[PDB]
Design an enzyme around this catalytic site. Sequence first.
Site, PDB file in Angstrom:
ATOM      1  N   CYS A  68       0.677  -1.571   0.480  1.00  0.00           N
ATOM      2  CA  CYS A  68      -0.153   0.231  -0.102  1.00  0.00           C
ATOM      3  C   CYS A  68       0.809   0.931   0.272  1.00  0.00           C
ATOM      4  O   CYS A  68       1.487   1.682   0.934  1.00  0.00           O
ATOM      5  CB  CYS A  68      -1.013   0.622   0.687  1.00  0.00           C
ATOM      6  N   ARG A 100      -0.188   4.207   2.481  1.00  0.00           N
ATOM      7  CA  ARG A 100       0.008   4.326   4.193  1.00  0.00           C
ATOM      8  C   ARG A 100       0.225   5.071   4.732  1.00  0.00           C
ATOM      9  O   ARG A 100       0.017   5.134   6.467  1.00  0.00           O
ATOM     10  CB  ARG A 100       0.571   3.121   4.338  1.00  0.00           C
ATOM     11  N   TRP A 138      -8.494   5.515  -0.814  1.00  0.00           N
ATOM     12  CA  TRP A 138      -9.498   6.251  -1.815  1.00  0.00           C
ATOM     13  C   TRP A 138      -8.622   6.212  -3.024  1.00  0.00           C
ATOM     14  O   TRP A 138      -7.467   5.301  -3.080  1.00  0.00           O
ATOM     15  CB  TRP A 138      -9.447   7.929  -2.088  1.00  0.00           C
ATOM     16  N   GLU A 180      -4.181   4.064 -11.748  1.00  0.00           N
ATOM     17  CA  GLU A 180      -4.991   3.284 -11.065  1.00  0.00           C
ATOM     18  C   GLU A 180      -6.203   2.606 -11.800  1.00  0.00           C
ATOM     19  O   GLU A 180      -6.084   1.437 -12.763  1.00  0.00           O
ATOM     20  CB  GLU A 180      -5.966   2.685  -9.411  1.00  0.00           C
TER      21      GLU A 180
HETATM   22  C1  HEM Z   1      -6.109   6.854   1.682  1.00  0.00           C
HETATM   23  C2  HEM Z   1      -6.427   5.430   0.634  1.00  0.00           C
HETATM   24  C3  HEM Z   1      -5.174   5.038  -0.331  1.00  0.00           C
HETATM   25  C4  HEM Z   1      -4.489   4.498  -1.396  1.00  0.00           C
HETATM   26  C5  HEM Z   1      -4.164   6.159  -2.079  1.00  0.00           C
HETATM   27  C6  HEM Z   1      -3.886   3.492  -1.345  1.00  0.00           C
HETATM   28  C7  HEM Z   1      -4.102   2.972  -2.652  1.00  0.00           C
HETATM   29  C8  HEM Z   1      -3.425   2.107  -3.323  1.00  0.00           C
HETATM   30  C9  HEM Z   1      -3.041   1.761  -4.416  1.00  0.00           C
HETATM   31  C10 HEM Z   1      -2.361   2.107  -5.068  1.00  0.00           C
HETATM   32  C11 HEM Z   1      -2.544  -0.146  -4.268  1.00  0.00           C
HETATM   33  C12 HEM Z   1      -2.262  -1.423  -5.142  1.00  0.00           C
HETATM   34  C13 HEM Z   1      -3.976  -1.755  -5.785  1.00  0.00           C
HETATM   35  C14 HEM Z   1      -3.891  -2.397  -7.083  1.00  0.00           C
HETATM   36  O1  HEM Z   1      -2.835  -2.193  -7.935  1.00  0.00           O
HETATM   37  O2  HEM Z   1      -3.834  -3.663  -7.005  1.00  0.00           O
HETATM   38  C15 HEM Z   1      -3.106  -0.948  -2.832  1.00  0.00           C
HETATM   39  C16 HEM Z   1      -2.780  -1.726  -2.179  1.00  0.00           C
HETATM   40  C17 HEM Z   1      -3.194  -2.199  -1.272  1.00  0.00           C
HETATM   41  N1  HEM Z   1      -3.939  -1.434   0.013  1.00  0.00           N
HETATM   42 FE1  HEM Z   1      -3.851   0.497  -0.204  1.00  0.00          FE
HETATM   43  N2  HEM Z   1      -4.373   2.676  -0.428  1.00  0.00           N
HETATM   44  C18 HEM Z   1      -5.390   3.447   0.316  1.00  0.00           C
HETATM   45  C19 HEM Z   1      -5.813   3.418   1.376  1.00  0.00           C
HETATM   46  C20 HEM Z   1      -5.807   1.522   2.172  1.00  0.00           C
HETATM   47  C21 HEM Z   1      -6.841   0.972   3.656  1.00  0.00           C
HETATM   48  C22 HEM Z   1      -7.605   2.416   4.135  1.00  0.00           C
HETATM   49  C23 HEM Z   1      -6.003  -0.019   3.936  1.00  0.00           C
HETATM   50  C24 HEM Z   1      -6.635  -0.436   4.900  1.00  0.00           C
HETATM   51  C25 HEM Z   1      -6.933  -0.778   5.779  1.00  0.00           C
HETATM   52  C26 HEM Z   1      -5.395   0.008   2.245  1.00  0.00           C
HETATM   53  C27 HEM Z   1      -5.154  -1.764   2.447  1.00  0.00           C
HETATM   54  C28 HEM Z   1      -4.041  -2.021   0.994  1.00  0.00           C
HETATM   55  C29 HEM Z   1      -3.537  -3.521   0.893  1.00  0.00           C
HETATM   56  C30 HEM Z   1      -3.957  -4.391   1.675  1.00  0.00           C
HETATM   57  C31 HEM Z   1      -2.983  -3.667  -0.049  1.00  0.00           C
HETATM   58  C32 HEM Z   1      -2.959  -4.446  -1.354  1.00  0.00           C
HETATM   59  C33 HEM Z   1      -4.273  -5.285  -1.999  1.00  0.00           C
HETATM   60  C34 HEM Z   1      -3.815  -5.896  -2.993  1.00  0.00           C
HETATM   61  O3  HEM Z   1      -2.729  -6.869  -2.581  1.00  0.00           O
HETATM   62  O4  HEM Z   1      -4.363  -6.753  -4.008  1.00  0.00           O
HETATM   63  N3  HEM Z   1      -4.997   0.621   1.523  1.00  0.00           N
HETATM   64  N4  HEM Z   1      -3.389   0.582  -1.749  1.00  0.00           N
HETATM   65  O1  LIG Z   2      -6.834   4.060  -4.952  1.00  0.00           O
HETATM   66  N1  LIG Z   2      -6.550   2.977  -6.060  1.00  0.00           N
HETATM   67  O2  LIG Z   2      -5.473   2.680  -7.076  1.00  0.00           O
HETATM   68  C1  LIG Z   2      -6.520   1.965  -4.880  1.00  0.00           C
HETATM   69  C2  LIG Z   2      -6.386   0.447  -5.821  1.00  0.00           C
HETATM   70  C3  LIG Z   2      -6.478  -0.828  -5.104  1.00  0.00           C
HETATM   71  C4  LIG Z   2      -7.054  -0.271  -3.301  1.00  0.00           C
HETATM   72  C5  LIG Z   2      -7.829   0.756  -2.370  1.00  0.00           C
HETATM   73  C6  LIG Z   2      -7.672   0.842  -1.033  1.00  0.00           C
HETATM   74 BR1  LIG Z   2      -8.423  -0.049  -0.341  1.00  0.00          BR
HETATM   75  N2  LIG Z   2      -7.468   2.469  -1.532  1.00  0.00           N
HETATM   76  N3  LIG Z   2      -7.347   2.891  -2.565  1.00  0.00           N
HETATM   77  C7  LIG Z   2      -7.249   1.981  -3.443  1.00  0.00           C
END
Ligand code: HEM
Ligand SMILES: O=[N+]([O-])c1cccc2c(Br)n[nH]c12
Lengths: 413, 413
Positions: free
Chosen positions: A110, A113, A282, A287
């Site tokens: 993520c 974070r 968000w 993406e």
């Molecule tokens: C607040 C804005 C947030 C942004 C901009 C963000 C962005 C992202 C992005 C770009 C990825 C890669 C997704 C992909 O390529 O499939 C990701 C993965 C991830 N995020 Fe964040 N995230 C946010 C919030 C969160 C929250 C609130 C959680 C959990 C409480 C979280 C948990 C994770 C996890 C576990 C992954 C791995 C997903 C996977 O392995 O398929 N994210 N996030």
């Molecule tokens: O922002 N993103 O591109 C994005 C992608 C995949 C999962 C998440 C979560 Br949970 N927050 N933002 C995400």
Amino acid sequence: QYVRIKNWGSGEILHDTLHHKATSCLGSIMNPKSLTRGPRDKPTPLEELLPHAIEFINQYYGSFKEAKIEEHLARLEAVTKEIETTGTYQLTLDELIFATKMAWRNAPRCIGRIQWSNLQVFDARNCSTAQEMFQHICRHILYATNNGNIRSAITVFPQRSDGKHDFRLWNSQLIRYAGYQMPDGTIRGDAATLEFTQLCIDLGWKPRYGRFDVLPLVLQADGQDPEVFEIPPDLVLEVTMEHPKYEWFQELGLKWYALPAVANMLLEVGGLEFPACPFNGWYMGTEIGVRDFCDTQRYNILEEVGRRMGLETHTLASLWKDRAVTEINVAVLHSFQKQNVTIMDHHTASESFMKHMQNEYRARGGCPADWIWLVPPVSGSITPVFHQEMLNYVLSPFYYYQIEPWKTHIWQN
Amino acid sequence: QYVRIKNWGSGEILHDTLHHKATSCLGSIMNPKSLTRGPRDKPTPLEELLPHAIEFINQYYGSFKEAKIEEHLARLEAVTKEIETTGTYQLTLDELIFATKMAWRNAPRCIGRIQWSNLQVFDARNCSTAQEMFQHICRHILYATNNGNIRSAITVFPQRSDGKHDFRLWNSQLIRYAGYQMPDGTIRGDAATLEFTQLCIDLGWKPRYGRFDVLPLVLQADGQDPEVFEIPPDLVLEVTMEHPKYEWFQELGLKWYALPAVANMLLEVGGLEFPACPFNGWYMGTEIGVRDFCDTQRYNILEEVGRRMGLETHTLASLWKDRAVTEINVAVLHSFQKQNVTIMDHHTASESFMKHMQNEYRARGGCPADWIWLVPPVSGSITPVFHQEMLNYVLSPFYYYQIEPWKTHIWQN
Ligand code: HEM
Ligand SMILES: O=[N+]([O-])c1cccc2c(Br)n[nH]c12
Ligand code: HEM
Ligand SMILES: C[C@H](O)[C@H](O)[C@H]1CNc2nc(N)[nH]c(=O)c2N1
Ligand SMILES: C[C@H](O)[C@H](O)[C@H]1CNc2nc(N)[nH]c(=O)c2N1
Ligand SMILES: O=[N+]([O-])c1cccc2c(Br)n[nH]c12
């Protein structure tokens, strides 16, 4: 002692000591077993559960500004008794809240974070039916969306007891478009959700046979068979794609949902497992613009946007693909900003993560990070994250992948 | 049995069995020990050398269309005798040629590997002095350059005997620009070569204090002290940067050498080690346009190219960085093509590697690959390599990194 980490852009050095608390060459594997927590048919062995519980209770109390020893020792005692008398234990609301944020904090993949401490937690551990699940998920979507001013939130369903009564969402994400294997050899909608779209049909969902058809929530409660529920359209906020210069962009008739909500992951904490805990944050522009719209296995709109631009789409060296993809990214960012829907570009995302990483090393001497995921799908080396050496390791609490339900689920009727 | 590999773009599956022959989480480490073959003060132990030698001799003969058993067994005998009577052995010219190409074939970080069988080999194992080294390196540069029609070649110097008589090039690359820590707090030239530029000065090199000052070859022969040699300017072919639209681009006064030649790597083959074996291929546009010109730790010309374009270089969300970098890439590709100097864009490079990978799996069930290096510094997911799961492993023959000479070298005078 510690592992030395270097940033080749700024020259800064960091000392990783946090990796010593990790749980346990597979280069670019998408879904490795090390990141997957599978099913069970028997309860968690007590000799295993208790050490994990105690270790979490120590982490929780050891995270306060000024320690509260009395309560700490009491919780240690009560937790032990609960396990002795019931075979498992119930997290207090504060512990659960703490756990969900930490697991996020520990998500190596993520980039967002820096927002880890800002998470709304919906305690749905008292839930017992699919209808109740569905109601909880709607409340989530509605809260999170907040009319474009997206808010990060998570909904926690009942923890796994014996593994035969698992609460599970069969959806990859809460909001997701359908994909149909059209007659003319082509594909309509989202090609990534082909096999799943079918499954919904095989369970009575009405295929509106389109392009941006929001799929239904497929909910499994108490280990029982999954029930199909359509998401109330009023809840699903969408952004229409418009380019600030190319007026022909809206002629593409593209859009995307504003809510990225992971629905199929398992939350692991102190020996306990939560097979259903949908969460969202968000979107990050690339993406949608790059992966969703440009992956060949997805919408694959790249060549088309190239032609409309009048590029030599038949000569790779012309770098036409590089040209189109950027306009699409500009479209996405412009559209979300115009329609007052929270969005973040990849450049700002990277700096944000870098700042976060530095805070994490100062706060706890480490930050689990998966370079392969943290680096944007475009403009790689142009972002600071690319020049940052990272250490990828699995801590606890943690968000694990799960084996797809349709592969292990034992049907009733 | 084998490791399953999947390509998420096309859906294709591959079975990797080649990884079983590997020699032996560190995520994105630049120079790990697993890829570094350090110095020695004693000869290679016979119990170690012989098995490695035999294993190579078996690989070499086992690579022919139609086996030549008689010669194979004879080489096995002769090699054993040579080791018994001399303590080491000399590779035949054909074996060396075979070794250099295989080591290239086994370079996990090289995207150009489809060209592996096309390598010119310069046998300089009879070399004994720095002056002779310098002459060999000039012959190399001249051959490789071929007046813009770049040719892949390698020059092999004498193998390590006892580790106290190592032939070594102190240069990272044959052709490389100098970097000076100018008065006004700034930096001139190539900031990456700061520490090395100084070392050249500390050895009598005349600092022409500029922007694109080709550094001198610093040669170490027979374990003796390094001698500085300036490269004959006529040998160093360069490309002047011109944009096919922005006439103000040439006002930037930029250029780059057409010859990418790695000079500090060690060739390992059949127990033998070659601490000096400079090699080259041709450039991939993004290396110059993106890394050399845009890395903040390098030329860092990004903002400047942004301004000249009239972009909101003060608002990251405007994606101005994405805009500039593409024009620079177009400049590079256009300049090389115009001046008839071999160049390859990253899109064409990727497809080429993909085709190569597929050939490799059909030919030998595997292809060691480092995703982190194989994916271009821009337009990541737009290239097929990004969606290809890979396995990174160290085979033999192999090109290893070495500990920088100035850190271990024992000075004479
Ligand atoms: C607040 C804005 C947030 C942004 C901009 C963000 C962005 C992202 C992005 C770009 C990825 C890669 C997704 C992909 O390529 O499939 C990701 C993965 C991830 N995020 Fe964040 N995230 C946010 C919030 C969160 C929250 C609130 C959680 C959990 C409480 C979280 C948990 C994770 C996890 C576990 C992954 C791995 C997903 C996977 O392995 O398929 N994210 N996030
Ligand atoms: O922002 N993103 O591109 C994005 C992608 C995949 C999962 C998440 C979560 Br949970 N927050 N933002 C995400
Ligand atoms: C014919 C054209 C070739 C192309 C386009 C090509 C391209 C590249 C590129 C883009 C890299 C990454 C460089 C970096 O980012 O620092 C690389 C690395 C590498 N290439 Fe190739 N290459 C070619 C030929 C060769 C040859 C002939 C050899 C050896 C016989 C070779 C050996 C390697 C090795 C060992 C690396 C790793 C360098 C390092 O780790 O710093 N390449 N090459
Ligand atoms: C094969 C490779 O692991 C896969 O295609 C990747 C790599 N990097 C990624 N990075 C992010 N953010 N999201 C992804 O889905 C992937 N997929
Ligand atoms: C930290 C990271 O490993 C480093 O900056 C990388 C990553 N990817 C790379 N890929 C290539 N081709 N060349 C490089 O120098 C690097 N450097
Ligand atoms: O093309 N390149 O960008 C490139 C970079 C670094 C080393 C080499 C060699 Br050897 N051939 N081509 C290279």
